[PDB]
Structures are given as C-alpha cells and as structure tokens.
Coordinates of N, CA and C in Angstrom, one line a residue:
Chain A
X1170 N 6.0 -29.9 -2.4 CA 6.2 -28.5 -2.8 C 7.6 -27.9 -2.3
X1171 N 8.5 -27.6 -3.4 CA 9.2 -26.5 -3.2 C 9.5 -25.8 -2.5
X1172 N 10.0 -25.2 -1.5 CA 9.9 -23.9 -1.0 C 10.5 -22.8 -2.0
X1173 N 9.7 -21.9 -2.4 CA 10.6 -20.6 -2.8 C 10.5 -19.5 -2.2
X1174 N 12.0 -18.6 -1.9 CA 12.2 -17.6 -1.3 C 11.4 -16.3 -0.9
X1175 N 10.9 -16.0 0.1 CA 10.9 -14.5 0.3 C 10.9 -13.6 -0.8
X1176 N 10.7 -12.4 -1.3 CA 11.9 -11.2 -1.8 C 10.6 -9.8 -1.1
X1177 N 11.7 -9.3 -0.4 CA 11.3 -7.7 0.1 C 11.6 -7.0 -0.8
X1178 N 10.3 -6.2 -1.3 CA 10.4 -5.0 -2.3 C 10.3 -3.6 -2.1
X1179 N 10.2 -3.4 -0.6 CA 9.6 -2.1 -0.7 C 10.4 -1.7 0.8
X1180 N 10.5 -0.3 1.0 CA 10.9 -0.1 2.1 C 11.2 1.8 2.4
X1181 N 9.7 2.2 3.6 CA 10.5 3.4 3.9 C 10.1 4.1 5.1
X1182 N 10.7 4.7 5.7 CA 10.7 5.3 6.9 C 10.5 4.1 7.8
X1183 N 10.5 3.1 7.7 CA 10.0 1.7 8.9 C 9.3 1.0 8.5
X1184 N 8.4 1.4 7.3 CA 7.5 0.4 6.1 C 7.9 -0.5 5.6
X1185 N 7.7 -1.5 5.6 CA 8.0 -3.0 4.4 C 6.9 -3.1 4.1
X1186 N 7.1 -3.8 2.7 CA 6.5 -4.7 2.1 C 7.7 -5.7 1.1
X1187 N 6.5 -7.2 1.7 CA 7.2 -8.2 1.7 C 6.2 -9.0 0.6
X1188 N 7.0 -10.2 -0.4 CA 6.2 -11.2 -1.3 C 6.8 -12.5 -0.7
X1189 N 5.5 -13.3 -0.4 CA 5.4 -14.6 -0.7 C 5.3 -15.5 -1.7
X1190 N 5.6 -16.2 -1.9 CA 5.2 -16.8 -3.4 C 4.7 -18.3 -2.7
X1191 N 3.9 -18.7 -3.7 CA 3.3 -20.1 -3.0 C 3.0 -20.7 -5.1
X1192 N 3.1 -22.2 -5.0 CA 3.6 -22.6 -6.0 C 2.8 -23.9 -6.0
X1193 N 1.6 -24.5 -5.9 CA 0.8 -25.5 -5.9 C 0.8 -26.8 -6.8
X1194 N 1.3 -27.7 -6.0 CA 1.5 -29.1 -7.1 C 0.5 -29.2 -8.0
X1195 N -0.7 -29.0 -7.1 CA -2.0 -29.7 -8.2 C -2.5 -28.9 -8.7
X1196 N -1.7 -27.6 -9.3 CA -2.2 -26.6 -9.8 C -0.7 -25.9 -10.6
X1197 N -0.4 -26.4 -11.7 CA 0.6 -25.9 -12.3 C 0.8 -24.3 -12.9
X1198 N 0.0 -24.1 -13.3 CA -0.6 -22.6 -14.0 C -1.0 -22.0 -12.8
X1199 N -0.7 -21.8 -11.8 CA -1.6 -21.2 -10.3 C -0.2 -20.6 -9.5
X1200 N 0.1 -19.4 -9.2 CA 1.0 -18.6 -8.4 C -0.3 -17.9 -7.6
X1201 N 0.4 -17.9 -6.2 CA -0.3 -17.2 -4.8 C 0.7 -16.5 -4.8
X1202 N 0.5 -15.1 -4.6 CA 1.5 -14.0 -4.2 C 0.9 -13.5 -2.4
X1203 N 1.4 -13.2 -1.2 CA 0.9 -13.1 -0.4 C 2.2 -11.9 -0.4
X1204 N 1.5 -10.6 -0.1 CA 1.9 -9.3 0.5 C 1.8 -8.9 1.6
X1205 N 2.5 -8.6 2.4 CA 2.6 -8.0 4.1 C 3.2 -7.1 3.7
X1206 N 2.7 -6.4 4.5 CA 3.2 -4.7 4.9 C 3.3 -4.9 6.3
X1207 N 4.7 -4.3 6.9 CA 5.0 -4.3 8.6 C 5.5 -2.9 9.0
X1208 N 5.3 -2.3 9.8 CA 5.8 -1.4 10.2 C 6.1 -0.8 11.7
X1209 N 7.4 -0.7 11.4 CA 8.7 -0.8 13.0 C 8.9 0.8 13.5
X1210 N 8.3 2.0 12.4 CA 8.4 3.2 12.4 C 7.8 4.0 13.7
X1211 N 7.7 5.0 14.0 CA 7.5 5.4 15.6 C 5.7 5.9 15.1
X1212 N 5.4 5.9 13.5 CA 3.8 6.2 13.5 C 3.0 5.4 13.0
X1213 N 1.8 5.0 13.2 CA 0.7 4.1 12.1 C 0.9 4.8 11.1
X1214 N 0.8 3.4 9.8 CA 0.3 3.6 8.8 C -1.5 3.3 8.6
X1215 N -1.7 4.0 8.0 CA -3.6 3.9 7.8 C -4.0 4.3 6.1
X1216 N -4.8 3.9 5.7 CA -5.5 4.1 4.5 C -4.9 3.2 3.4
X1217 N -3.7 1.8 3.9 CA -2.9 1.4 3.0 C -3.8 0.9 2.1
X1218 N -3.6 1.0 0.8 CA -4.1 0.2 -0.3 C -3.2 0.0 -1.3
X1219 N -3.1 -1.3 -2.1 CA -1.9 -2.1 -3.1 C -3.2 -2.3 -4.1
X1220 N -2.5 -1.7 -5.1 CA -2.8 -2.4 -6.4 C -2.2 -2.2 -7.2
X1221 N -1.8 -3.6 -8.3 CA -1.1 -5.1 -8.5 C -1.5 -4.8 -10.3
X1222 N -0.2 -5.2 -11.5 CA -0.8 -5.7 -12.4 C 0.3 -6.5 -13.0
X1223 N 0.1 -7.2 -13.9 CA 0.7 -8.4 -14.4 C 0.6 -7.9 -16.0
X1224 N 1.8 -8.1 -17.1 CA 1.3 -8.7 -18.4 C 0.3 -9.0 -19.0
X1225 N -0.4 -8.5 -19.8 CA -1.8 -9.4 -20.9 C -1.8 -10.2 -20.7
X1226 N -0.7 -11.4 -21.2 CA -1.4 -12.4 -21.0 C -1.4 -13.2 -19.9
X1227 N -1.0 -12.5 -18.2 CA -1.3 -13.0 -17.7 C -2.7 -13.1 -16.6
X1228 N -3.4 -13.4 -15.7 CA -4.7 -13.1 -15.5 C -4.3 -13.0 -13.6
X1229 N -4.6 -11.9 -13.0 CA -4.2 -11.5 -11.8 C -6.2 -11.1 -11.1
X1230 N -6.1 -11.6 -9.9 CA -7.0 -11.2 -9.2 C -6.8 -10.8 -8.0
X1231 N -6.9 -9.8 -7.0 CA -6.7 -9.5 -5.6 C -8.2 -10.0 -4.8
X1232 N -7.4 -10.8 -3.4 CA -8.5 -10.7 -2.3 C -8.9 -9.7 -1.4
X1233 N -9.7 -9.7 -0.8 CA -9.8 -8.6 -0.2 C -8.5 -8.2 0.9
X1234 N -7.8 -7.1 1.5 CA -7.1 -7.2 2.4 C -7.3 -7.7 3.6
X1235 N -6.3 -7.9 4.1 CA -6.6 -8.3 6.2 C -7.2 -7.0 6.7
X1236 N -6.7 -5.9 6.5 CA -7.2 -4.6 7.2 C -6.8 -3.7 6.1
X1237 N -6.8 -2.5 6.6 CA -6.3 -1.0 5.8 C -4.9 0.0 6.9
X1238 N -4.6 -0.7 8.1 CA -3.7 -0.5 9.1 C -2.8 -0.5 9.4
X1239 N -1.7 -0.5 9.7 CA -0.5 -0.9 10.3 C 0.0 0.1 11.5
X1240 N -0.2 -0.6 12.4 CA 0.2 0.2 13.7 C 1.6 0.0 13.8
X1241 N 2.4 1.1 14.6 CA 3.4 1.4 14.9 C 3.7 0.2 15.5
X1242 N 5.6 0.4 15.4 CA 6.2 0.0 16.8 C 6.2 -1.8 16.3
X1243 N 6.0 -2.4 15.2 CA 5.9 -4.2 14.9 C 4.0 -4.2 15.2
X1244 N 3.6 -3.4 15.3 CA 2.5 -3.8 14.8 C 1.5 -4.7 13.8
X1245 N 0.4 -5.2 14.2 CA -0.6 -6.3 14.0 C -0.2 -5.8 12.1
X1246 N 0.5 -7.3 10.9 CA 0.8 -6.7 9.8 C -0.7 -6.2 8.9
X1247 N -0.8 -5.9 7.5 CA -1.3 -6.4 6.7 C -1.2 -7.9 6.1
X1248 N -2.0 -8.1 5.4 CA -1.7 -9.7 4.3 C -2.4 -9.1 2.9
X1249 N -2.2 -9.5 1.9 CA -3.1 -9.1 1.1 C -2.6 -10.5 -0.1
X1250 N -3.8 -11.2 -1.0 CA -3.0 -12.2 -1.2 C -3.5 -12.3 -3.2
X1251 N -2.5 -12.5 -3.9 CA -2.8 -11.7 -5.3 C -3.2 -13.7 -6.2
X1252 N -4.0 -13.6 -6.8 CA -3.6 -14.8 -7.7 C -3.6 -14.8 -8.7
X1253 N -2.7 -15.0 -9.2 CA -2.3 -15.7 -10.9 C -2.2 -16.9 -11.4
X1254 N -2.7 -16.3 -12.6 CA -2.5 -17.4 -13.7 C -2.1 -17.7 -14.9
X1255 N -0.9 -18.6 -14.7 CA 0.2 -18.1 -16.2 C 0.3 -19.8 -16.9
X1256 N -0.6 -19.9 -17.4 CA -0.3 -21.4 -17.9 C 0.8 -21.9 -19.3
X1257 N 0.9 -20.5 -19.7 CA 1.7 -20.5 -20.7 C 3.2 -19.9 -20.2
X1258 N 3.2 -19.9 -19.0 CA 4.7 -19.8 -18.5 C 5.2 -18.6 -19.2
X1259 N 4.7 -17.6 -18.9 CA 5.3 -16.2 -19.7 C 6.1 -15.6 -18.6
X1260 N 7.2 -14.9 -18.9 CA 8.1 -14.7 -17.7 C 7.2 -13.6 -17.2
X1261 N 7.5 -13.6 -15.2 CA 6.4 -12.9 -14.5 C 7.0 -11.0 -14.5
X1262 N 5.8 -10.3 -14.8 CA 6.7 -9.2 -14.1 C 5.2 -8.6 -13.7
X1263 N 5.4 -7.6 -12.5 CA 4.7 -7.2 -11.4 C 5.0 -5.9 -11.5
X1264 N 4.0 -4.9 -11.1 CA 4.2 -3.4 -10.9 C 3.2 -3.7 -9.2
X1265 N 3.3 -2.4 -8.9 CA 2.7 -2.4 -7.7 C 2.6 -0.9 -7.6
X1266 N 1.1 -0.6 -7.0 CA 1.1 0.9 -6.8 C 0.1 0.9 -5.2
X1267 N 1.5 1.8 -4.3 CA 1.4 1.6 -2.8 C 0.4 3.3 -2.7
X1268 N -0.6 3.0 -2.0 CA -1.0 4.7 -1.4 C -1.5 4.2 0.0
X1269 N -0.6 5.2 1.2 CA -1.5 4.8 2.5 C -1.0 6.6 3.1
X1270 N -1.0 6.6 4.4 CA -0.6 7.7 4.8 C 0.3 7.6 6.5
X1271 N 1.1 8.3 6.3 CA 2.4 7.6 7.6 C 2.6 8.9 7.8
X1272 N 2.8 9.3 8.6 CA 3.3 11.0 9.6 C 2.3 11.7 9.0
X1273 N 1.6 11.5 8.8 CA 0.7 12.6 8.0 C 1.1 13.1 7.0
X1274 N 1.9 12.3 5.9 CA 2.1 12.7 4.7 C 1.7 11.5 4.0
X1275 N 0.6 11.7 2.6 CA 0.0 10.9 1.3 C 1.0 10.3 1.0
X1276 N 1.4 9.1 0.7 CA 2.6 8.4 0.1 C 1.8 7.9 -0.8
X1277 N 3.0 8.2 -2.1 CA 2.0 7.9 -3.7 C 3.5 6.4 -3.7
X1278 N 3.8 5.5 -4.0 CA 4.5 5.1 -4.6 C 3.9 3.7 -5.9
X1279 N 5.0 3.7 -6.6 CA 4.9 3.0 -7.6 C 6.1 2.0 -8.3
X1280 N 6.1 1.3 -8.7 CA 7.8 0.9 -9.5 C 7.2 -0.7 -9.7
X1281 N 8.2 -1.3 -10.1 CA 8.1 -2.9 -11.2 C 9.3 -3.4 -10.1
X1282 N 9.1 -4.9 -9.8 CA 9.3 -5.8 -8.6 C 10.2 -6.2 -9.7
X1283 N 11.6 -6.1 -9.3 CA 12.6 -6.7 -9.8 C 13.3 -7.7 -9.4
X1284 N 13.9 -9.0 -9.6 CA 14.2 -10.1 -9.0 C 13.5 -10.7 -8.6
X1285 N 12.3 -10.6 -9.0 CA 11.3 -12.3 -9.3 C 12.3 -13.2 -9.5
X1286 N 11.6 -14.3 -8.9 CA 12.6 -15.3 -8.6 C 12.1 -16.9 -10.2
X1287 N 12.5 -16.8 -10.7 CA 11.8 -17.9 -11.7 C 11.3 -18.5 -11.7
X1288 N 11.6 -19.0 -9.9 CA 10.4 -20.5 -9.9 C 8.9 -19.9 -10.0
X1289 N 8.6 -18.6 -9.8 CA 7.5 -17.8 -9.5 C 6.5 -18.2 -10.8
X1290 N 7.2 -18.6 -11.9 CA 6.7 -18.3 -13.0 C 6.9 -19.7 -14.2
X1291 N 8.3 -20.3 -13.9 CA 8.5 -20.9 -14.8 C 7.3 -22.3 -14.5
Chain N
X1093 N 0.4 -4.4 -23.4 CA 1.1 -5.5 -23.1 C 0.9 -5.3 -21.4
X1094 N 0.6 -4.6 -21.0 CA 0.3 -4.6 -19.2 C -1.1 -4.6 -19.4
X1095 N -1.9 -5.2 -18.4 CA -3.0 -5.5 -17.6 C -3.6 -4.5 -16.9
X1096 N -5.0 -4.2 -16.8 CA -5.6 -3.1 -15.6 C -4.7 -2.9 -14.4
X1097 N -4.5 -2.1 -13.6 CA -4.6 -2.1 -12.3 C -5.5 -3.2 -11.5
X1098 N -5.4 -4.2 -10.8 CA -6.2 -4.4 -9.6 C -5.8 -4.4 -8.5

C-alpha cells in the first residue's frame, strides 16, 4: 500500500482537525477516512461532534467517536473514523459539519474539504 | 446529488 498524504482542514483558536486517508489493497472500492481533532489552545474543547456527507452515489458510514473531548494544552486527541465506498470511482467530495464548545462559545462550523488528494478516490 | 448528513 501506498502511502497517501495527510491534509489538515480545519483550524481555530488552537483547534485542528486533521484527515487520514487509508487505501486497502484487498479492497479497491473501500476509502478509511480517520479524523482527529487536537487541541493546543489554553481551553477544552467538549460536546465535539463531526458529521460527514459524500455525493449520491457514494455510500459513507461513521464509527462511533474515541470520546466527545479535547482537553487543553496537546491534549488526549479525538479519532473519529468515516468509511466509504466508491467503486465507481466518482471523484470524492466531502462536507463536514463541526459543533462542539471552546471558551464557552457554541461553534457552528461547516464548509466542503478542498484538496482531496486523488489517490483518495481514484 | 449530496447524501444525508452522518
């Protein structure tokens, strides 16, 4: 297998979120997306929840998260790990809608993951 | 042409 790159999509106040991609020989039509959230900021994040959608015709399922957490300071991350399935090789595109709570303010965010990397998909 | 939320 391959290795393909990293890409960080998100970022604020000390918040990331980061994509893995994983790309399985014996499974051609099969993308593993693995999401981390880290945070270096002076407060926890708490109540984080990601949810993920893909194109019609492609077929997306989330696992459960590692926690709902992220403590301050490089704290213990999230993982959250998405799977797809694109056997028809349709080019990938991703939204993502972030809600958790950091300083005591509701963060609503939302937007489409740009710079997918091809091998993600092709 | 987009999928539910999950």
């Amino acid at each position: 297998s391959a290795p393909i790159p990293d890409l960080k999509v998100f970022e604020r106040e000390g918040v990331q979120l980061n994509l893995s991609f994983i790309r399985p020989p014996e499974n051609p039509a099969l993308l593993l997306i693995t999401i981390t959230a880290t945070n270096f900021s002076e407060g926890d994040v708490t109540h984080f929840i990601c949810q993920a959608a893909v194109p019609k015709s492609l077929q997306l399922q989330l696992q459960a998260p590692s926690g709902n957490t992220v403590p301050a300071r490089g704290g213990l991350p999230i993982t959250q790990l998405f799977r797809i399935l694109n056997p028809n090789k349709a080019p990938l595109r991703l939204k993502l809608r972030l809600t958790y709570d950091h300083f005591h303010q509701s963060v609503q965010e939302i937007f489409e993951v740009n710079n997918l990397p091809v091998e993600s998909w092709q | 042409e987009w999928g539910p939320w999950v």
